[PDB]
Write a protein that holds these residues in place. Sequence first.
Motif, PDB file in Angstrom:
ATOM      1  N   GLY A  81      -1.425 -22.244   3.913  1.00 55.35           N
ATOM      2  CA  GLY A  81      -2.461 -22.795   4.788  1.00 55.35           C
ATOM      3  C   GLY A  81      -3.082 -21.791   5.751  1.00 55.35           C
ATOM      4  N   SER A  82      -2.635 -20.535   5.682  1.00 56.45           N
ATOM      5  CA  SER A  82      -3.124 -19.471   6.567  1.00 56.45           C
ATOM      6  C   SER A  82      -4.651 -19.364   6.565  1.00 56.45           C
ATOM      7  CB  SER A  82      -2.510 -18.124   6.158  1.00 56.45           C
ATOM      8  OG  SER A  82      -2.888 -17.086   7.051  1.00 56.45           O
ATOM      9  N   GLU A  83      -5.254 -19.315   7.754  1.00 63.70           N
ATOM     10  CA  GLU A  83      -6.680 -18.972   7.847  1.00 63.70           C
ATOM     11  C   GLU A  83      -6.929 -17.460   7.748  1.00 63.70           C
ATOM     12  OE1 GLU A  83      -8.524 -21.549  10.715  1.00 63.70           O
ATOM     13  OE2 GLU A  83      -6.832 -21.507  12.101  1.00 63.70           O
ATOM     14  N   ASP A  84      -5.849 -16.689   7.648  1.00 58.32           N
ATOM     15  CA  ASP A  84      -5.946 -15.289   7.269  1.00 58.32           C
ATOM     16  C   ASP A  84      -5.927 -15.243   5.747  1.00 58.32           C
ATOM     17  OD1 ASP A  84      -5.647 -12.544   6.693  1.00 58.32           O
ATOM     18  OD2 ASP A  84      -4.441 -12.189   8.492  1.00 58.32           O
ATOM     19  N   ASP A  85      -7.105 -15.035   5.160  1.00 59.65           N
ATOM     20  CA  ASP A  85      -7.279 -15.076   3.703  1.00 59.65           C
ATOM     21  C   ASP A  85      -6.415 -14.061   2.949  1.00 59.65           C
ATOM     22  OD1 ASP A  85     -10.486 -16.374   4.164  1.00 59.65           O
ATOM     23  OD2 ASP A  85      -9.096 -17.227   2.698  1.00 59.65           O
ATOM     24  N   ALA A  86      -6.107 -12.943   3.607  1.00 61.47           N
ATOM     25  CA  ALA A  86      -5.149 -11.962   3.090  1.00 61.47           C
ATOM     26  C   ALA A  86      -3.715 -12.515   3.036  1.00 61.47           C
ATOM     27  CB  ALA A  86      -5.194 -10.681   3.927  1.00 61.47           C
ATOM     28  N   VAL A  87      -3.293 -13.170   4.116  1.00 57.70           N
ATOM     29  CA  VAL A  87      -1.954 -13.755   4.202  1.00 57.70           C
ATOM     30  C   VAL A  87      -1.791 -14.883   3.173  1.00 57.70           C
ATOM     31  CG1 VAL A  87      -0.351 -15.064   5.686  1.00 57.70           C
ATOM     32  CG2 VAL A  87      -1.509 -13.036   6.583  1.00 57.70           C
ATOM     33  N   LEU A  92      -0.003 -16.996  -2.376  1.00 55.26           N
ATOM     34  CA  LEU A  92      -0.341 -17.427  -3.725  1.00 55.26           C
ATOM     35  C   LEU A  92       0.171 -16.476  -4.803  1.00 55.26           C
ATOM     36  CD1 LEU A  92      -3.931 -18.766  -3.027  1.00 55.26           C
ATOM     37  CD2 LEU A  92      -2.010 -20.162  -3.902  1.00 55.26           C
ATOM     38  N   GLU A  93       0.246 -15.180  -4.488  1.00 51.89           N
ATOM     39  CA  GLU A  93       0.805 -14.219  -5.428  1.00 51.89           C
ATOM     40  C   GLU A  93       2.318 -14.375  -5.506  1.00 51.89           C
ATOM     41  OE1 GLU A  93      -0.768 -12.549  -7.645  1.00 51.89           O
ATOM     42  OE2 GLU A  93       0.770 -11.182  -8.427  1.00 51.89           O
ATOM     43  N   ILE A  94       2.958 -14.590  -4.362  1.00 44.90           N
ATOM     44  CA  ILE A  94       4.384 -14.909  -4.333  1.00 44.90           C
ATOM     45  C   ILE A  94       4.672 -16.145  -5.204  1.00 44.90           C
ATOM     46  CG2 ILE A  94       6.212 -15.871  -2.815  1.00 44.90           C
ATOM     47  CD1 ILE A  94       5.344 -13.699  -0.769  1.00 44.90           C
ATOM     48  N   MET A  95       3.866 -17.194  -5.062  1.00 48.16           N
ATOM     49  CA  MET A  95       4.006 -18.416  -5.886  1.00 48.16           C
ATOM     50  C   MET A  95       3.968 -18.108  -7.397  1.00 48.16           C
ATOM     51  SD  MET A  95       4.365 -21.819  -5.508  1.00 48.16           S
ATOM     52  CE  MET A  95       5.700 -21.458  -6.659  1.00 48.16           C
ATOM     53  N   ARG A  96       2.933 -17.386  -7.812  1.00 48.50           N
ATOM     54  CA  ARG A  96       2.778 -16.902  -9.185  1.00 48.50           C
ATOM     55  C   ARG A  96       3.980 -16.078  -9.646  1.00 48.50           C
ATOM     56  NH1 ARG A  96       1.110 -12.812 -12.598  1.00 48.50           N
ATOM     57  NH2 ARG A  96       1.505 -11.314 -10.901  1.00 48.50           N
ATOM     58  N   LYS A  97       4.413 -15.135  -8.821  1.00 46.39           N
ATOM     59  CA  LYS A  97       5.522 -14.269  -9.210  1.00 46.39           C
ATOM     60  C   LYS A  97       6.836 -15.067  -9.260  1.00 46.39           C
ATOM     61  CE  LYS A  97       4.807 -10.296  -6.727  1.00 46.39           C
ATOM     62  NZ  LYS A  97       4.614  -8.812  -6.578  1.00 46.39           N
ATOM     63  N   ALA A  98       6.982 -16.038  -8.359  1.00 42.84           N
ATOM     64  CA  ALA A  98       8.166 -16.933  -8.373  1.00 42.84           C
ATOM     65  C   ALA A  98       8.227 -17.806  -9.636  1.00 42.84           C
ATOM     66  CB  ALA A  98       8.207 -17.786  -7.119  1.00 42.84           C
ATOM     67  N   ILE A  99       7.061 -18.288 -10.073  1.00 42.91           N
ATOM     68  CA  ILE A  99       6.942 -19.065 -11.306  1.00 42.91           C
ATOM     69  C   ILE A  99       7.294 -18.208 -12.541  1.00 42.91           C
ATOM     70  CG2 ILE A  99       5.264 -20.181 -12.846  1.00 42.91           C
ATOM     71  CD1 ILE A  99       4.075 -21.495 -10.192  1.00 42.91           C
ATOM     72  N   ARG A 129      -6.384 -25.922   3.587  1.00 41.55           N
ATOM     73  CA  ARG A 129      -6.039 -24.717   2.831  1.00 41.55           C
ATOM     74  C   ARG A 129      -4.687 -24.859   2.136  1.00 41.55           C
ATOM     75  NH1 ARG A 129      -7.788 -19.133   4.133  1.00 41.55           N
ATOM     76  NH2 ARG A 129     -10.034 -19.280   4.574  1.00 41.55           N
ATOM     77  N   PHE A 130      -3.723 -25.436   2.844  1.00 36.37           N
ATOM     78  CA  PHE A 130      -2.416 -25.771   2.279  1.00 36.37           C
ATOM     79  C   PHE A 130      -2.556 -26.719   1.082  1.00 36.37           C
ATOM     80  CE2 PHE A 130       1.265 -28.655   2.121  1.00 36.37           C
ATOM     81  CZ  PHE A 130       2.298 -27.747   1.905  1.00 36.37           C
ATOM     82  N   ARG A 131      -3.348 -27.772   1.246  1.00 32.53           N
ATOM     83  CA  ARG A 131      -3.559 -28.754   0.188  1.00 32.53           C
ATOM     84  C   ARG A 131      -4.113 -28.093  -1.066  1.00 32.53           C
ATOM     85  NH1 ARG A 131      -8.890 -31.417   0.126  1.00 32.53           N
ATOM     86  NH2 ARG A 131      -8.457 -32.154   2.253  1.00 32.53           N
ATOM     87  N   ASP A 132      -5.138 -27.256  -0.891  1.00 32.91           N
ATOM     88  CA  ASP A 132      -5.757 -26.531  -2.004  1.00 32.91           C
ATOM     89  C   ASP A 132      -4.823 -25.488  -2.627  1.00 32.91           C
ATOM     90  OD1 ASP A 132      -7.998 -28.135  -1.600  1.00 32.91           O
ATOM     91  OD2 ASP A 132      -9.212 -26.538  -0.679  1.00 32.91           O
ATOM     92  N   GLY A 133      -4.021 -24.833  -1.786  1.00 30.92           N
ATOM     93  CA  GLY A 133      -3.011 -23.881  -2.244  1.00 30.92           C
ATOM     94  C   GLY A 133      -1.944 -24.558  -3.089  1.00 30.92           C
ATOM     95  N   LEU A 134      -1.554 -25.753  -2.661  1.00 32.99           N
ATOM     96  CA  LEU A 134      -0.564 -26.562  -3.361  1.00 32.99           C
ATOM     97  C   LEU A 134      -1.077 -27.020  -4.730  1.00 32.99           C
ATOM     98  CD1 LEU A 134       2.336 -27.618  -2.817  1.00 32.99           C
ATOM     99  CD2 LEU A 134       1.258 -29.595  -1.691  1.00 32.99           C
ATOM    100  N   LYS A 135      -2.347 -27.421  -4.784  1.00 29.27           N
ATOM    101  CA  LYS A 135      -2.971 -27.836  -6.037  1.00 29.27           C
ATOM    102  C   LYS A 135      -3.041 -26.660  -7.007  1.00 29.27           C
ATOM    103  CE  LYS A 135      -6.080 -31.147  -7.970  1.00 29.27           C
ATOM    104  NZ  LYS A 135      -6.154 -32.619  -7.685  1.00 29.27           N
TER     105      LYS A 135
END
Lengths: 276, 275
Positions: A81-87, A92-99, A129-135
Amino acid sequence: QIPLGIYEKALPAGECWLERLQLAKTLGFDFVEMSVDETDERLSRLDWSREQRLALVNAIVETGVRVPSMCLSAHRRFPLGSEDDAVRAQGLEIMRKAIQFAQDVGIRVIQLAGYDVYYQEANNETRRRFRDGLKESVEMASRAQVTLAMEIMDYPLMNSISKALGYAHYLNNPWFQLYPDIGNLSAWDNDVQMELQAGIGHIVAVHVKDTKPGVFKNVPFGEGVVDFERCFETLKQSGYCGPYLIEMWSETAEDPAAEVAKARDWVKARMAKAGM
Amino acid sequence: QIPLGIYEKALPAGCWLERLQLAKTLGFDFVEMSVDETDERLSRLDWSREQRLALVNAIVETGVRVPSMCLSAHRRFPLGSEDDAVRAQGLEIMRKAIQFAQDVGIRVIQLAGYDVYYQEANNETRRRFRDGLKESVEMASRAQVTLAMEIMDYPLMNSISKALGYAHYLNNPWFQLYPDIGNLSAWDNDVQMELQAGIGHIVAVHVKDTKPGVFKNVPFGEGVVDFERCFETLKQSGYCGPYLIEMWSETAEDPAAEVAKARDWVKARMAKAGM
Ligand SMILES: [Zn+2]
Ligand SMILES: [Zn+2]
Ligand SMILES: [Zn+2]
Ligand SMILES: [Zn+2]
């Protein structure tokens, strides 16, 4: 049968996984839940070589002790949900790599942290942002066929089974399920027993720990407000047949194995009382 | 992404490294393993640790996954059998399949929805199958392994709706749905309705053509399946999962060439539907 697991961070800290799994077996556990937390050391597991990934699979198959779940608390540091688009891109990359990691070593369930932001203040922007990240995360999960399971949290956005069920209805995806922590569920103003029953067809795993209002870490079993016997009774009577994971941080204790053995017998006495 | 996979039996019979490397050169993301009625494929559930680990190694080396297992062995040892010995063998196969999936990192075991196949069904086979499924789901809940019911060439499970009824009965996150759009179209179903209805439960999709009463080796485009419609329904409904191309070109003139053509044919239908 009742599969019983121990949190990685209850045991000694060595990146020696065969030793970790042998110890868990010795202590009477069926599985170990891996942690991929905020520390660079555990985060670096997502960059493990093929040989490192395969060595873990080897140790699991050799010992019979499974690593069916990963606690992904790294999102506390890199929230979706970070408003820092880099963070956020980092979360999201951590999520991908965890998967991908779960695909590689055969982890069944990735336990997600329900923080839109932790160290930063929350607002409508962080929730969206969290909601969209989760989706986005669940889409990756659907492609990979890996279960993501939202933990009930030490944080208002996800502090009950009901709120997680809200997200589950929004997502309407078989790969998004629930991972209640009965400690966290008990530390607010929830009707805990009703929540446990309400979530039943979505509960894939249960974290077992004690808590107090506003105290979600290192509360000794029996010193908090969790009614363990009641929780176990409710889950058993509602038809729950999945694993239970004892969550504690005895890695720092003088004798981690001794602390774990005492919590194990304590928890098991309450399960037995509840008819299991 | 649209993850695209190839059925084991579409490729030449054989080691797994060779098969996974073949799938890679043919452009597939994954291969679906078969554990059928043969003693040869059944013997996989009795593989040693070394054999299981060699498969894992090969998957990791090629990057071609084996995320699902078709468990058609239940035709031979059905959970609804009124013979307690046959039913027990079916339950043992189920247990061993779940353990195999844990060992090798298989995500989804596809269940055959037959109470009995080589015998006549009755109230008792149905009751036995129901209880067998409940026991199977209890095993899957402990192991955290997904069981997904295929939509079948058989009345008991010939629609998503029927599989949905079992899902509502079991009320368990580890029992899900694996529609085969061929089988779904070979009856009197409202196909597009069904696909949308099941959306929250669909973990995978079998892609093959059929004709009413002919559920096998009907060439792509020669049957009744409306591929572009099914793909657009699934797309518009928010399906984000894998598609598995089911064929038995293993024993065709040029198997690799057959699968390449079918691959491009399927992908053309998908492209037409917005994919
Ligand atoms: Zn629900
Ligand atoms: Zn927890
Ligand atoms: Zn449903
Ligand atoms: Zn099929």
